[PDB]
């Protein structure tokens, strides 16, 4: 957890202590999460070094970094890293999953694609609420689940992906069931209104009235709770 960002063969070394300092002003960063004891990480290491050197030499350069997930537990938690090597591209501070091959040609091409100023992530099914539209959305929905989250909160990240997955399955229903989220650190006035004092905080709204959500936080369970609570008890 040293403050210094060292470079090892062209590749920056990031850890729980220096990660935010380093990435906060970078539009695009390539990340590798590895474990010291992983043979496949060791085999990939020279290829990742070649990638770092290719991306350093384009105009403008794109930083390439590695993280030891076994000692950077906070980061591995934030990025929901379970297996190695895991590659991610950080674009304006948000993680994009890389599921392709561990080759220079594919990784460099994808990095260059996401680095483009007009590149956008796939749109998400989950509704974004702010003080401007919160009431209009919530009051018109027969039932709606709302997650109040803080971007700074590490323990939350493990199941943030499950929430989007649940939202996608629930939107394909007749009638569709909406899931929404509220960034409580940005939306301080909504957070106070609903007495948000900790995270995650999930609330079900039924005809505009809030109820604490005490269901499960895994995809299948969120989907089932919501289906059953909407009036399909046998489903
Ligand atoms: Cl209606
Ligand atoms: Zn209506
Ligand atoms: Zn059920």
Curated annotation (Swiss-Prot):
Domain of life from the UniProt record: Eukaryota
Cysteines paired by S-S bonds: 38-41, 153-156
Subcellular location: Endoplasmic reticulum lumen; Melanosome
Domain Thioredoxin, residue spans: 1-116, 105-231
Chain positions of motif CXXC: 38-41
Quaternary structure note: Part of a large chaperone multiprotein complex comprising DNAJB11, HSP90B1, HSPA5, HYOU, PDIA2, PDIA4, PDIA6, PPIB, SDF2L1, UGGT1 and very small amounts of ERP29, but not, or at very low levels, CALR nor CANX. Component of a complex containing at least CRELD2, MANF, MATN3 and PDIA4.
Family according to the record: Belongs to the protein disulfide isomerase family.
Name of the protein in question: Protein disulfide-isomerase A4
Whole sequence portion shown: 54 to 284 of 645
